[PDB]
mmCIF file of all heavy atoms in Angstrom:
data_model
loop_
_atom_site.group_PDB
_atom_site.id
_atom_site.type_symbol
_atom_site.label_atom_id
_atom_site.label_comp_id
_atom_site.label_asym_id
_atom_site.label_seq_id
_atom_site.Cartn_x
_atom_site.Cartn_y
_atom_site.Cartn_z
ATOM 1 N N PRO M 25 2.951 -8.361 9.109
ATOM 2 C CA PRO M 25 2.088 -7.607 10.038
ATOM 3 C C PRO M 25 1.018 -6.763 9.368
ATOM 4 O O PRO M 25 0.123 -6.258 10.036
ATOM 5 C CB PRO M 25 3.080 -6.687 10.773
ATOM 6 C CG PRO M 25 4.400 -7.279 10.567
ATOM 7 C CD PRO M 25 4.349 -7.902 9.211
ATOM 8 N N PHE M 26 1.137 -6.581 8.057
ATOM 9 C CA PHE M 26 0.279 -5.667 7.304
ATOM 10 C C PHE M 26 -0.675 -6.350 6.329
ATOM 11 O O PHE M 26 -1.299 -5.664 5.548
ATOM 12 C CB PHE M 26 1.151 -4.622 6.541
ATOM 13 C CG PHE M 26 2.286 -4.084 7.384
ATOM 14 C CD1 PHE M 26 3.572 -4.580 7.232
ATOM 15 C CD2 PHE M 26 2.040 -3.180 8.411
ATOM 16 C CE1 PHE M 26 4.609 -4.130 8.049
ATOM 17 C CE2 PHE M 26 3.088 -2.719 9.222
ATOM 18 C CZ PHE M 26 4.349 -3.230 9.050
ATOM 19 N N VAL M 30 -5.146 -4.510 11.557
ATOM 20 C CA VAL M 30 -4.561 -4.602 12.886
ATOM 21 C C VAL M 30 -5.638 -5.153 13.845
ATOM 22 O O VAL M 30 -6.827 -4.802 13.726
ATOM 23 C CB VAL M 30 -4.057 -3.219 13.330
ATOM 24 C CG1 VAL M 30 -3.592 -3.239 14.778
ATOM 25 C CG2 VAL M 30 -2.933 -2.751 12.435
ATOM 26 N N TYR M 35 -4.208 -4.840 20.187
ATOM 27 C CA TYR M 35 -3.845 -3.426 20.372
ATOM 28 C C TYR M 35 -5.116 -2.641 20.701
ATOM 29 O O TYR M 35 -5.708 -2.017 19.828
ATOM 30 C CB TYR M 35 -3.224 -2.884 19.063
ATOM 31 C CG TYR M 35 -1.933 -3.588 18.712
ATOM 32 C CD1 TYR M 35 -1.895 -4.560 17.727
ATOM 33 C CD2 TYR M 35 -0.752 -3.273 19.360
ATOM 34 C CE1 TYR M 35 -0.702 -5.183 17.378
ATOM 35 C CE2 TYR M 35 0.443 -3.886 19.022
ATOM 36 C CZ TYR M 35 0.463 -4.857 18.047
ATOM 37 O OH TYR M 35 1.666 -5.460 17.744
ATOM 38 N N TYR M 38 -5.644 0.975 19.622
ATOM 39 C CA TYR M 38 -5.272 1.307 18.241
ATOM 40 C C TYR M 38 -6.094 2.452 17.622
ATOM 41 O O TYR M 38 -5.514 3.387 17.075
ATOM 42 C CB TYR M 38 -5.315 0.061 17.341
ATOM 43 C CG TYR M 38 -4.631 0.300 16.010
ATOM 44 C CD1 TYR M 38 -3.258 0.427 15.932
ATOM 45 C CD2 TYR M 38 -5.364 0.392 14.832
ATOM 46 C CE1 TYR M 38 -2.616 0.619 14.715
ATOM 47 C CE2 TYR M 38 -4.731 0.561 13.599
ATOM 48 C CZ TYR M 38 -3.353 0.695 13.548
ATOM 49 O OH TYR M 38 -2.685 0.870 12.355
ATOM 50 N N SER M 77 1.746 2.739 10.695
ATOM 51 C CA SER M 77 2.802 2.037 11.442
ATOM 52 C C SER M 77 3.729 3.042 12.121
ATOM 53 O O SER M 77 4.059 2.889 13.291
ATOM 54 C CB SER M 77 3.588 1.129 10.503
ATOM 55 O OG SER M 77 4.511 0.348 11.249
ATOM 56 N N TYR M 80 1.846 4.632 15.123
ATOM 57 C CA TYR M 80 1.538 3.755 16.258
ATOM 58 C C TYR M 80 2.769 3.193 16.941
ATOM 59 O O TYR M 80 2.679 2.811 18.109
ATOM 60 C CB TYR M 80 0.560 2.649 15.848
ATOM 61 C CG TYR M 80 0.014 1.897 17.040
ATOM 62 C CD1 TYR M 80 -0.999 2.439 17.823
ATOM 63 C CD2 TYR M 80 0.550 0.677 17.418
ATOM 64 C CE1 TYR M 80 -1.488 1.763 18.931
ATOM 65 C CE2 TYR M 80 0.086 0.005 18.535
ATOM 66 C CZ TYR M 80 -0.948 0.541 19.276
ATOM 67 O OH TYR M 80 -1.357 -0.101 20.416
ATOM 68 N N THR M 81 3.940 3.202 16.262
ATOM 69 C CA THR M 81 5.129 2.638 16.881
ATOM 70 C C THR M 81 5.555 3.419 18.145
ATOM 71 O O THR M 81 5.589 4.654 18.160
ATOM 72 C CB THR M 81 6.255 2.454 15.875
ATOM 73 O OG1 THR M 81 7.263 1.655 16.482
ATOM 74 C CG2 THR M 81 6.836 3.755 15.392
ATOM 75 N N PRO M 82 5.866 2.683 19.222
ATOM 76 C CA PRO M 82 6.332 3.366 20.441
ATOM 77 C C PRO M 82 7.801 3.785 20.325
ATOM 78 O O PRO M 82 8.285 4.556 21.146
ATOM 79 C CB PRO M 82 6.121 2.316 21.537
ATOM 80 C CG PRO M 82 6.270 0.992 20.831
ATOM 81 C CD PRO M 82 5.839 1.211 19.381
ATOM 82 N N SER M 86 11.280 -0.358 16.745
ATOM 83 C CA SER M 86 10.388 -1.494 16.939
ATOM 84 C C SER M 86 10.454 -2.474 15.771
ATOM 85 O O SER M 86 10.819 -2.071 14.666
ATOM 86 C CB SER M 86 8.961 -1.019 17.178
ATOM 87 O OG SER M 86 8.347 -0.645 15.952
ATOM 88 N N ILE M 88 7.971 -4.188 14.081
ATOM 89 C CA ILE M 88 6.971 -3.943 13.034
ATOM 90 C C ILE M 88 7.288 -2.676 12.250
ATOM 91 O O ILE M 88 7.240 -2.696 11.025
ATOM 92 C CB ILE M 88 5.583 -3.937 13.667
ATOM 93 C CG1 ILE M 88 5.262 -5.363 14.149
ATOM 94 C CG2 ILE M 88 4.527 -3.461 12.653
ATOM 95 C CD1 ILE M 88 4.028 -5.509 15.037
HETATM 96 C C1 UUV O 1 0.922 -4.190 12.238
HETATM 97 O O1 UUV O 1 0.700 -3.173 13.122
HETATM 98 C C2 UUV O 1 0.263 -3.624 14.369
HETATM 99 C C3 UUV O 1 0.054 -2.304 15.135
HETATM 100 N N1 UUV O 1 1.338 -1.605 15.145
HETATM 101 C C4 UUV O 1 2.466 -1.964 15.893
HETATM 102 C C5 UUV O 1 3.443 -1.072 15.512
HETATM 103 BR BR1 UUV O 1 5.220 -1.047 16.159
HETATM 104 C C6 UUV O 1 2.876 -0.179 14.539
HETATM 105 N N2 UUV O 1 1.554 -0.525 14.321
#
Side-chain angles (χ1 to χ4, degrees):
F26 317 100
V30 173
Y35 296 103
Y38 193 71
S77 186
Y80 191 78
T81 192
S86 78
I88 292 169

